[PDB]
Amino acid sequence: ASIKVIGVGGGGNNAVNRMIENEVQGVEYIAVNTDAQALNLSKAEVKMQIGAKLTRGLGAGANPEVGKKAAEESKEQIEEALKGADMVFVTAGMGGGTGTGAAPVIAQIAKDLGALTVGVVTRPFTFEGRKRQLQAAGGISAMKEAVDTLIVIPNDRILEIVDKNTPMLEAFREADNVLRQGVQGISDLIATPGLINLDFADVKTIMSNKGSALMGIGIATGENRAAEAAKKAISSPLLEAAIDGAQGVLMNITGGTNLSLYEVQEAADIVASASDQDVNMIFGSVINENLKDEIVVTVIATGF
């Protein structure tokens, strides 16, 4: 399968770098930006400046309309870069000019090419202000029309997970990590050939529900790590509605070389048990030789 991750605007730029830093395999990275400076800080092999004539590489100035026009100017280039993709992830923060405006255009392009297209976006922090919140609402509803499934991460909820003393700067940094965890949760079960690699066809069916999608993450160590992580993931503040209200649940459990089948099954039980009896649920596992004693459980819940 040909899997592409497109980061769009600053928010997406940081998520993509974060995936590359964490050596996420089996995917092609495309950084898309209107801001030449930020784009030059991208680690992606493909760097695509959009709206060069409109913006002159200066960014979209917080205007979603400029980001939209910028992607339309470059739509032929966008089509070309996406050609042959079976799945694409369009990742962006909502609220500013480029992510809000170009991500829907880039998502629709990917959708019209026949790719299974998943959007993974952040809803901005309340502290970012009303203008960002309003523009983010517009982007989110525009994104919904343009993707097969839209995972929305509420940044405010990150504030409930990190320490009360966390500086704003590290709050943003953690938002970059949650976005990345969103994409990798799904992509690792598909792109990288794992022991219980679920078929693209059943992923296609989970990822084709209407309504919105949400995510939960759980991390635990040592004795009882699988159970602790799964319970943390299904009760994650990131997961705004209860997981029982979802048709289709994807579960990714990742651990070091010491991850046992018993662990995978235990985690999967808790998640299946926390869901509706009639849920379409798939789960996979992945081995990360960089993790020692920690286990990560990622849950994606669709069709709320």
Strand order in the sheet with 214-221: 214-221, 294-301, 249-255, 281-287
Which residues are CB-neighbours of 201 under 8 A, at least 6 positions away?
none
Residues 254 and 146 in one domain: no
- Cβ(12)–Cβ(42) below 8 Å: no
99 annotated to bind ligand: yes
β partners of residue 8: 32
* Claim to verify: residue 248 and residue 166 sit in the same structural domain: no
Q: How many domains does the chain have?
A: 2
Q: What range does the domain containing 268 cover?
A: 210-304
How many of the other CB atoms lie within 10 Å of CB of 131? Answer: 12
Looking from the CA of 211 toward its CB, the CA atoms found within 13 Å total: 13
Residue 248 sits in a domain of what CATH number? 3.30.1330.20
Asked which of 182, 209, 236 is the last residue of a domain, the reply is 209
Residue type, 46: V
Same domain, 41 and 179: yes
**Co-location of 179 and 257 in the same domain:** no
In terms of Cα–Cα distance, which of 144, 143, 145, 86 is closest to 115?
86
Domain boundary among 155, 184, 209: 209
> Is 35 marked as binding a ligand?
no
Q: What string of H, E and C letters represents the secondary structure of 96-126?
A: CCHHHHHHHHHHHHHHHCCCEEEEEEEECCH
Instruction: Determine if residue 12 is labeled as part of a ligand binding site.
Output: yes
In this structure, is the dihedral angle defined by the CA atoms of residues 63, 69, 75 and 77, taken in order, positive or negative? negative
**DSSP assignment of the chain, as one string?**
--EEEEEEHHHHHHHHHHHHHTT--S-EEEEEESBHHHHTT---SEEEE--HHHHTTB--TT-HHHHHHHHHHTHHHHHHHHTT-SEEEEEEESSSSHHHHHHHHHHHHHHHTT-EEEEEEEEPPGGG-HHHHHHHHHHHHHHHHH-SEEEEEEHHHHTTTS-TT--HHHHHHHHHHHHHHHHHHHHHHHTS--TT---HHHHHHHTT-SS-BEEEEEEEESTTHHHHHHHHHHT-TT--S-GGG-S-EEEEEEE-TT--HHHHHHHHHHHHHHS-TT--EEEEEEE-TT-SSEEEEEEEE---
Same domain, 296 and 268: yes
Residue 163 marked as a ligand binder = no
**Are residues 139 and 189 both part of a single domain?**
yes
Q: Which of 20, 36, 18, 37 is nearest to 28 (CA)?
A: 20
Q: Is 216 found in the same domain as 187? A: no
**Is there a binding annotation on residue 177?**
no
Residues 134 and 227 reside in one and the same domain: no
Indicate if 195 and 233 belong to the same structural domain.
no
As a whole number of angstroms, the distance between CA 267 and CA 261 comes to 10
* 119 labeled binding residue: no
* Among candidate residues 209, 244, 278, the one where a domain is terminated: 209
**One domain for residues 55 and 201:** yes
CA atoms 106, 147, 68, 178: torsion sign: negative
| 132 annotated to bind ligand | yes
User: Tokens standing for 101?
Assistant: 């405006």
Shared domain check, 283 and 228: yes
- The answer for residues whose C-beta is within 8 angstroms of residue 212's C-beta and 6 or more apart is 144, 150, 152, 304
First to last CA, the chain: 28
Q: What is the CATH number of the domain that holds 193?
A: 3.40.50.1440
Q: Is 176 annotated as a binding residue?
A: yes
Same domain as 243, residue 230: yes
Q: Is 13 annotated as a binding residue?
A: yes
